[PDB]
Amino acid sequence: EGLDFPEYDGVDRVINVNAKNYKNVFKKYEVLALLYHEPPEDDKASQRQFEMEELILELAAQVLEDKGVGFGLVDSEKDAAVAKKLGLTEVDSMYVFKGDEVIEYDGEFSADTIVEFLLDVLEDPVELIEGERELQAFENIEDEIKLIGYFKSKDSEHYKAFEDAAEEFHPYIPFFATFDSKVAKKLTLKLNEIDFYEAFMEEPVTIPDKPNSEEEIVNFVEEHRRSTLRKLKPESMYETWEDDMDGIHIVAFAEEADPDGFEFLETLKAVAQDNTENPDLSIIWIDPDDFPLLVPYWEKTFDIDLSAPQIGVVNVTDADSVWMEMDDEEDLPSAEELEDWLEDVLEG
Ligand SMILES: [Ca+2]
Ligand SMILES: [Ca+2]
Ligand SMILES: [Ca+2]
Ligand SMILES: [Ca+2]
């Protein structure tokens, strides 16, 4: 008899966090994920929706039990006093507490993404570059903002300020550091210098006025928080989509694992690089392979075939959209053709 794969065991591990136990709960767990939620309305549908959300947390709780991650619920009415003491303000959101750090979760509510997120939370906020493999891994990061600094040692005042700033964006924005002058020469970094890499960009921008305090780094990252080309990721999809440019998003569908999707993606990078100075411009790359449960909805709402690359303009108010025509029997449009089509659409 072969041993079974792991399965959900039906044992309840999600804690009802209330005024009587919330102090004891925070002492038991190093990392604690709390769902701050309104009580479900009396209709059956609202109870089923909450029933689903709680079981998703139960699954994540079973997977992360051995690593010491706790899961809890905070009722916005029954536990209003707990919400005030913990700083839980945005209802129906999940808050992650890692010691004396509070991390808000801005992603899809599924066991997959929540578990991957919390595993990232558990890691140290700064990743150290020592060997060639670590340096090569840093250079190959392109689908997200990244920062790298060169400091004298882990005990440098300027590294500790860099580490304090990394905790503010943990674990969404990767922070990298080196204390090796050879690695710093390969990255063209002076001592206490921090290079900021916009997503999908080759040239970094140096944070000015080095050495940088924690506040200088935090102010710089927030000011450059929106890259010209951004990828929609499950762990941060709601944050990205709410940062629209005056009510619209330019949306591009491209399956990276597909040869046409890959070619179209390389064109999108060229478009973004050629317009990287434009502050208002926001292009969102969606890989439909990352969101299989939304593909039927997207194909119906936008009247497009996601088996092929697509690009359009979406109105965030009503989901009204317009999508560029592309005939697959010929070459995909060049960056010049894409820029031309976007100009005419946006001119209206
Ligand atoms: Ca509770
Ligand atoms: Ca440099
Ligand atoms: Ca400074
Ligand atoms: Ca840019």
Curated annotation (Swiss-Prot):
Changing residue 9 to N: In TAM1; increased calcium-dependent susceptibility to proteolytic degradation; decreased calcium-dependent aggregation; decreased calcium-dependent polymerization; no effect on subcellular localization; no effect on the subcellular localization of STIM1; decreased calcium content of intracellular stores; loss of the ability to inhibit store-operated calcium entry (SOCE) activity. GO terms for cellular component: endoplasmic reticulum; mitochondrial matrix; mitochondrion; sarcoplasmic reticulum; sarcoplasmic reticulum lumen; sarcoplasmic reticulum membrane; smooth endoplasmic reticulum; T-tubule. One of its GO terms (molecular function) is calcium ion binding. Glycans are attached at residue 315. GO terms for biological process: endoplasmic reticulum organization; positive regulation of release of sequestered calcium ion into cytosol; positive regulation of store-operated calcium channel activity; protein polymerization; regulation of skeletal muscle contraction by regulation of release of sequestered calcium ion; regulation of store-operated calcium entry; response to denervation involved in regulation of muscle adaptation; response to heat. The modification Phosphoserine is found at residues 46, 181. Gene3D superfamilies: Glutaredoxin (3.40.30.10). The modification Phosphotyrosine is found at residue 8. Expressed in myoblasts (at protein level). CDD domains: PDI_b'_Calsequestrin_C (cd03074), PDI_b_Calsequestrin_middle (cd03066), PDI_b_Calsequestrin_N (cd03065). Keywords: Calcium, Disease variant, Endoplasmic reticulum, Glycoprotein, Membrane, Metal-binding, Mitochondrion, Muscle protein, Phosphoprotein, Sarcoplasmic reticulum, Signal. It is a peripheral membrane protein. It is found in: Endoplasmic reticulum; Sarcoplasmic reticulum; Sarcoplasmic reticulum lumen; Sarcoplasmic reticulum membrane. Monomer; increases in response to a depletion of intracellular calcium. Homodimer. Homotetramer and homopolymer. Can form linear homooligomers. Ca(2+) ions promote oligomerization. Interacts (via C-terminal end and preferentially with the monomeric form) with STIM1; this interaction increases in response to a depletion of intracellular calcium, decreases both STIM1 aggregation and clustering, interaction of STIM1 with ORAI1 and store-operated Ca(2+) entry (SOCE) activity. Interacts with ASPH and TRDN. Calsequestrin is a high-capacity, moderate affinity, calcium-binding protein and thus acts as an internal calcium store in muscle. Calcium ions are bound by clusters of acidic residues at the protein surface, often at the interface between subunits. Can bind around 80 Ca(2+) ions. Regulates the release of lumenal Ca(2+) via the calcium release channel RYR1; this plays an important role in triggering muscle contraction. Negatively regulates store-operated Ca(2+) entry (SOCE) activity. Belongs to the calsequestrin family. It is linked to Myopathy, vacuolar, with CASQ1 aggregates: An autosomal dominant mild muscle disorder characterized by adult onset of muscle cramping and weakness as well as increased levels of serum creatine kinase. The disorder is not progressive, and some patients may be asymptomatic. This is Calsequestrin-1. The lineage of its organism: Eukaryota, Metazoa, Chordata, Craniata, Vertebrata. The gene is CASQ1.
